[PDB]
Amino acid sequence: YTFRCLQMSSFANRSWSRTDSVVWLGDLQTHRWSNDSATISFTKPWSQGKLSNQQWEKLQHMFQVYRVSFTRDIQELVKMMSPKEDYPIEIQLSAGCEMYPGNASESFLHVAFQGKYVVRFWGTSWQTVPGAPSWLDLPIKVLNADQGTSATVQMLLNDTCPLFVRGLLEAGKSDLEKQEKPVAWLSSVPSSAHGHRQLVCHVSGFYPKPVWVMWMRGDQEQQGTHRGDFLPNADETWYLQATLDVEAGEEAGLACRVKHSSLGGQDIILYW
Amino acid sequence: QKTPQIQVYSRHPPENGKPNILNCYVTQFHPPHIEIQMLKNGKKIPKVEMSDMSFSKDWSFYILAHTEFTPTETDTYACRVKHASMAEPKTVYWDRD
Amino acid sequence: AAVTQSPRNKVAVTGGKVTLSCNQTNNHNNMYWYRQDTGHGLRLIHYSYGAGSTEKGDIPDGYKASRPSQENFSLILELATPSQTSVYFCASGDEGYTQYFGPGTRLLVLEDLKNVFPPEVAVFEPSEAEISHTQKATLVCLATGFYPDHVELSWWVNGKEVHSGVCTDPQPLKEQPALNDSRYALSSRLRVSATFWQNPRNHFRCQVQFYGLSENDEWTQDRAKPVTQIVSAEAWGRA
Amino acid sequence: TQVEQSPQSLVVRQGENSVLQCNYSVTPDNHLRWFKQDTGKGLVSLTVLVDQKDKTSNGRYSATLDKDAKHSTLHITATLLDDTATYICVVGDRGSALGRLHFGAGTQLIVIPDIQNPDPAVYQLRDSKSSDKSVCLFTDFDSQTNVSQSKDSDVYITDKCVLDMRSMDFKSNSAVAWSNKSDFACANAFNNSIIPEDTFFPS
Ligand SMILES: CCCCCCCCCCCCCCCCCCCCCCCCCC(=O)N[C@@H](CO[C@H]1O[C@H](CO)[C@H](O)[C@H](O)[C@H]1O)[C@H](O)[C@H](O)CCCCCCCCCCCCCC
Ligand SMILES: *[C@@H]1O[C@H](CO)[C@@H](O[C@@H]2O[C@H](CO)[C@@H](O)[C@H](O)[C@H]2NC(C)=O)[C@H](O)[C@H]1NC(C)=O
Ligand SMILES: *[C@@H]1O[C@H](CO)[C@@H](O)[C@H](O)[C@H]1NC(C)=O
Ligand SMILES: *[C@@H]1O[C@H](CO)[C@@H](O)[C@H](O)[C@H]1NC(C)=O
């Protein structure tokens, strides 16, 4: 399971600015914090994890101070870099920690400037990853001067993140291990080339994310199956469709087999 | 600036007369400012529910727009998206098959 | 880390152009301009993150900043107003939070310079009664008939400025209190040992530095221009 | 408005300790600085407090910081005459150059010097050239003696000024009086002020 706090900050000009954050634990949303809201909102009942009411307020207040502090720090940094860098500016942040068995963790804090990954917090300081421009050496020098924030970020990544996620995984064990049965349906679309036809196998409403969808001639599996990308549903379930370019006549005597954890042993087979 | 990819699909298997949910998954767009509209035969649907905007590992943004709809053999459904990367708003219709 | 400010005192007229300069040889990227007023703390006017850069502070209105180089940062008052009568402070710093402050600049904006006068300095020799009674000798300096109260009094013994046994009035008294905006008078005392004053080779001198008009300032009045000058009086020791 | 100091001003005697307060509403609070500013002079840094619960010391100066209470105190143990200055409290909202400095109005401290051996007297001092012009100097009076301004407009009297002869550890209060009028004399100069009965008046 990978826990991540995704922040998206937009600075249109010297005055206008907004920062919105979304927090995830695997493929499930746990928190949301829009620029309009003065407090971090829970999207799951177990979003507070194993933290006490007093422990959460202390944590939320740190973020509340950070959000205001961050907005000004970027505004001043743009002043410090002018005319080299100017608005519109879009700064993204991806901070969290991936959990491993046997009390093992690996924490990250990645910063992206205008869609490109440029800065990261590593060890005891801010650092520019390879590929990043050299002008960022001055903002990093200034950001590394502030020892107070460095000690806070160090504590947050090394201790606060793994301890919170451990409890979060304990509290949300039921929702993460939840099983949803997939409903499959067949359809056909005539392809661009004269002769062949694309046969689609629409699979929807399955959870967890790993699934097996393939086109079968009966018992022999077809190598020409093209499984698409995972598309999300509103009710936190998944959608996936697998295509197969079959010639007009090969359509009959073909089925779609779907194997998922929720189904158990009996796989969903739909004959054309 | 990257061109957004729009994917329109039904939550439940489509059946004429039965109420379903139409999902519009807009991906691979930067900057994150966009205007999503789910239309029924041309006119914009009033109660379109939006999901919080997020981004993948490749830092490209994503958002899911969904609304309740009753499919018919005559009624057409589409997703019109206006982004800075495109001179004209991209309108992709819903193909049942 | 030292920061210098020029001038240390300035007497300007309403509508005139005033430029307060600040030099720093510490190779600091950032420089800040503040003003100190009674009943208030130091308020930020303008600041610069480097050469070419000029950023508005909390109270910028009426002031224009200029950063021609890393070393210099100037505060320009295009059209001086009497509300700009304040003590202006400069500061510089690197990536750290520490701001190294300058010695300050006193600025006075008058409605007119028609009643500006330099002081008349007179040194009064210690009394023989004091020398016999206390075995100490107090010298008294007296600067008179000067406008405005922008003066720096100093005591100099044999070409070297002294501070021990020196005491100057905190505020100069008005020569004509009844008269609106009248001339000032300021006195200072230097106390030495009887045996030191009795030495005829010791040269005592009271120096008053007056801050008034500059070469660029026009003078239409018939009397001598009341320019920024040093007025001093001397006294030699005797047994 | 964000940084406030108490008391506004205070008067202490030499050797007595003085405690100065600072309360601030500044968010965030990275560091706190205590500045000493002499009348006319610049800003001299006394101490910097950075921890959540900090306690610093520099000679006679000692300060404490409580970031949770957003309060700071400055103790000046055994105050001396040279401690007479304005003390300014400063709060920085960042640990880097990105920070803004939030200054307090200041606390004005006045230290009354300790006069060990008083000997009040009014001496006549004459000008180097020409000697016809002269001044009346009232010196070596105790801290309790107050010099009142002249009722006569043509007569000029200065307020008490204390000099320190550092080499001999000697301190003396002095006030000067002068007038161009012929009626003016040192015996009648400081008549408007309450002067001690043992004040020496030479011929
Ligand atoms: C992180 C996981 C922890 C697990 C907790 C899970 C809870 C789930 C809730 C999550 C809510 C979602 C919120 C979005 C989270 C985004 C992740 C980013 C977190 C950033 C760490 C927070 C830093 C905390 C310290 C801070 O607020 N610093 C403040 C205040 O510091 C001041 O006040 C302090 C006391 O409050 C001290 O006294 C300090 O000495 C003084 O200077 C400081 O201002 C920092 O600079 C803030 C910015 C940091 C981001 C820099 C990004 C680099 C960008 C470079 C690009 C250059 C562009 C050039 C034009
Ligand atoms: C947080 O963990 C990092 C390791 O990821 C610690 O960083 C090391 O700190 C020591 C000094 O304490 C350095 O010698 C190492 O070089 C650092 N490692 C790296 C990779 O830079 C850091 O000290 C930890 N912080 C806290 C507060 O525990
Ligand atoms: C700043 O950007 C916003 C959003 O793009 C815009 O509405 C506003 O007019 C802009 N302000 C200025 C000062 O240009
Ligand atoms: C973002 O939030 C801050 C504080 O609530 C506010 O000052 C700012 O104007 C907001 N920006 C927008 C665009 O809503």
Of A68, A77, A146, the CB nearest to D95: A146
Final residue before a domain boundary, out of D83, D113, D143: D113
Verify that D70 and D159 share a domain, yes or no. Answer: no
**Tokens standing for residue B63:** 């958002």
**Rounded to whole angstroms, what are the CA distances from D121 to C125, C137, C187, D144, D171?**
17, 13, 19, 15, 15
Q: Is the CB of A88 under 6 A from ligand 3?
A: no
User: Residue A21 and residue A6: Cα distance in Å, rounded?
Assistant: 6
Is residue C19 within 8 A of residue C72, CB to CB? The reply is no
**Tokens standing for residue B49:** 């529910």
Widest Cα–Cα separation across chain C? 66
The ligand whose atoms approach the alpha carbon of A64 most closely is 1
- Of the CA atoms within 13 Å of residue C12, those in its CB half-sphere come to 26
CA B86 to chain CA centroid, Å, is 16
∠ CA(A80), CA(A84), CA(A89), 5° rounding? Answer: 80
Q: Nearest Cα to A166, choosing from A7, A57, A5, A46?
A: A46
**Tokens standing for residue A86:** 């100017």
What are the b/e assignments for C40-56, b being 16+ CB within 10 Å?
ebbebbbbbbbeebbbe
User: Residue A199 and residue A242: Cα distance in Å, rounded?
Assistant: 8
Is residue A212 within 8 A of residue A238, CB to CB? The reply is no
**Tokens standing for residue C233:** 């009086």
Q: Nearest Cα to B90, choosing from B35, B31, B28, B21?
A: B35
- How would you class A241 by CB atoms within 10 Å of its CB: exposed for 0-12, middle for 13-18, buried for 19 or more? buried
Of A187, A204, A231, the CB nearest to B97: A187
**Rounded to whole angstroms, what are the CA distances from D21 to A16, D5, D9, D50, D75?**
39, 6, 11, 17, 9
Side chain identity, residue D85: A
How many other CB atoms sit within 10 Å of the CB of residue C14?
A: 15
User: Residue D37 and residue D20: Cα distance in Å, rounded?
Assistant: 14
Please state the domain count of chain D.
2
Q: Does D165 touch chain C (CB under 8 A)?
A: yes
Is residue A10 within 8 A of residue B32, CB to CB? The reply is yes
What does the H/E/C string look like for chain D?
Answer: CCEEEECCEEEEECCCCEEEEEEECCCCCCEEEEEEECCCCCEEEEEEECCCEEEEEECCEEEEEECCCCEEEEEECCCCHHHCCEEEEEEECCCCCCCCEEECCCEEEEEECCCCCCCCEEEEEEECCCCCCEEEEEEEECCCCCCCCCCCCCEEECCCEEEEECCCCEEEEEEEEEECCCCCCHHHHCCCCCCCCCCECCC
Q: Nearest Cα to C150, choosing from C201, C102, C221, C211?
A: C211
What are the b/e assignments for D14-47, b being 16+ CB within 10 Å?
beeebebebebebebbbbbbbbbbeeeebbeebb
Strand partners, B10: B22
Verify that D99 and D121 share a domain, yes or no. Answer: no
For chain C, domains (ranges, CATH) are 1-111 (2.60.40.10), 112-239 (2.60.40.10)
3-state secondary structure of C111: coil
Any idea which residue has 């020791």 for tokens? C237
User: Residue A100 and residue C43: Cα distance in Å, rounded?
Assistant: 53
User: Residue D122 and residue D174: Cα distance in Å, rounded?
Assistant: 10
Chains C and D touch (3+ CB pairs under 8 A): yes
Cα dihedral C212, C218, C221, C222 sign: positive
Helix (H) or strand (E) segment spanning residue C58: none
Verify that D83 and D1 share a domain, yes or no. Answer: yes
Side chain identity, residue D47: T
CATH number of the domain that residue D85 is part of? 2.60.40.10
Verify that D17 and D109 share a domain, yes or no. Answer: yes
**Tokens standing for residue A169:** 């995984």
Distance A4 CA to ligand 1 centre (A): 15
Side chain identity, residue D141: F
CA C225 to chain CA centroid, Å, is 19
User: Residue D35 and residue C41: Cα distance in Å, rounded?
Assistant: 12
Helix (H) or strand (E) segment spanning residue C80: none
User: Residue A92 and residue C39: Cα distance in Å, rounded?
Assistant: 44
Experimental method: X-ray
- Of the CA atoms within 13 Å of residue A17, those in its CB half-sphere come to 19
Q: Does A252 touch chain C (CB under 8 A)?
A: no
Q: What is the CATH number of domain B1-97?
A: 2.60.40.10
Count contacts between A and B (CB, < 8 Å). 72
Verify that D100 and D119 share a domain, yes or no. Answer: no
- Length reported for chain B: 97
User: Residue D53 and residue D87: Cα distance in Å, rounded?
Assistant: 22
User: Residue D138 and residue A24: Cα distance in Å, rounded?
Assistant: 83
Verify that D152 and D60 share a domain, yes or no. Answer: no
What does the H/E/C string look like for A93-153?
Answer: EEEEEEEECCCEEEEEEEEEECCEEEEEEECCEEEECCCCCHHHHHHHHHHCCCHHHHHHH
What are the b/e assignments for C204-223, b being 16+ CB within 10 Å?
bbbbbbbbbbeeebeeeeee
User: Residue A258 and residue C178: Cα distance in Å, rounded?
Assistant: 105
Using CA atoms of A118, D30, A124, A168 in order, give the dihedral in degrees to the nearest 10: -80
How many other CB atoms sit within 10 Å of the CB of residue C5?
A: 19
Final residue before a domain boundary, out of D113, D139, D166: D113
Is residue C159 within 8 A of residue C207, CB to CB? The reply is no
Is residue A1 within 8 A of residue A23, CB to CB? The reply is no
Q: What is the DSSP string of chain B?
A: -BPPEEEEEESS---TTS-EEEEEEEEEEBSS-EEEEEEETTEEPS--EEPPPEE-TTS-EEEEEEEEE---SS--EEEEEEETT-SS-EEEE----
| E-strand stretches of C147-216 | 151-157, 160-162, 166-168, 173-174, 184-193, 203-210
**Binding pocket residue ranges, ligand 1, CB within 6 Å:** A 5, 7, 21, 23, 31, 33, 40, 59, 63, 65-66, 69-70, 73-74, 77-78, 81, 85, 93, 95-96, 111, 113, 119, 139, 143, 146, 148-149, 152-153, 156, 160-161, 164; D 28, 30, 94-95
What does the H/E/C string look like for chain A?
Answer: CEEEEEEEEEECCCCCCEEEEEEEECCEEEEEECCCCCCCEECCCCCCCCCCHHHHHHHHHHHHHHHHHHHHHHHHHHHHHCCCCCCCEEEEEEEEEEEECCCEEEEEEEEEECCEEEEEEECCEEEECCCCCHHHHHHHHHHCCCHHHHHHHHHHHHHHHHHHHHHHHHHCHHHHCCCECCEEEEEEEECCCCCEEEEEEEEEEEECCCCEEEEECCCCECCCEEECCCEECCCCCEEEEEEEEEECCCCCCCEEEEECCCCCCCCEEEEC
Q: Does A145 touch chain C (CB under 8 A)?
A: yes
Q: Nearest Cα to A143, choosing from A88, A74, A200?
A: A74
Looking from the CA of residue A78, the nearest atom of ligand 1 is: 60
| Cβ contacts of D200 within 8 Å, gap of 6 or more | C133, D119, D120, D121, D122
Is residue A154 within 8 A of residue A169, CB to CB? The reply is no
Verify that D57 and D1 share a domain, yes or no. Answer: yes
DSSP structure class, residue C56? E
Verify that D182 and D171 share a domain, yes or no. Answer: yes
Residue A158 φ then ψ, to 5° = -70, -40
For chain A, domains (ranges, CATH) are 1-177 (3.30.500.10), 178-272 (2.60.40.10)
Side chain identity, residue C125: E
C-alpha Rg value of chain A to the nearest Å: 24
Final residue before a domain boundary, out of D98, D113, D128: D113
User: Residue A212 and residue A203: Cα distance in Å, rounded?
Assistant: 10
User: Residue D30 and residue D54: Cα distance in Å, rounded?
Assistant: 12
Q: Nearest Cα to A200, choosing from A218, A215, A186, A214?
A: A186
Is residue D44 within 8 A of residue D37, CB to CB? The reply is yes
Containing domain of residue D15, as a range?
1-113
User: Residue D178 and residue D124: Cα distance in Å, rounded?
Assistant: 10
| Cβ contacts of A188 within 8 Å, gap of 6 or more | A197, A198, A199, A200, A251, B97
Side chain identity, residue C195: T
Verify that D123 and D58 share a domain, yes or no. Answer: no
Looking from the CA of residue A19, the nearest atom of ligand 4 is: 1
C-alpha Rg value of chain B to the nearest Å: 14
User: Residue A111 and residue A94: Cα distance in Å, rounded?
Assistant: 7
Cα dihedral D13, D19, D23, D29 sign: positive
In chain B, where the domains are located: 1-97
CA B49 to chain CA centroid, Å, is 11
Q: Is the CB of A83 under 6 A from ligand 2?
A: no
Q: Nearest Cα to D189, choosing from D160, D148, D161?
A: D148
Distance A67 CA to ligand 1 centre (A): 7
Side chain identity, residue C200: P
Q: Nearest Cα to C234, choosing from C141, C104, C109?
A: C141
Q: Nearest Cα to D138, choosing from C187, C102, A47, A27?
A: C187
How far does chain D reach from its first CA to its final CA, in angstroms? 59
Question: D94 to chain C: which residues are within 8 Å by CB?
Answer: 97
**Tokens standing for residue A185:** 């349906």
Residue B58 φ then ψ, to 5° = -90, 15
| Helices marked H in C135-190 | none
Side chain identity, residue A168: L
The ligand whose atoms approach the alpha carbon of A13 most closely is 3
DSSP structure class, residue C131? H
Q: Nearest Cα to C139, choosing from C121, C160, C119?
A: C121
Say if residue A208 is preceded by a cis peptide, omega within 30 of 0: yes
**Tokens standing for residue D74:** 């400055």
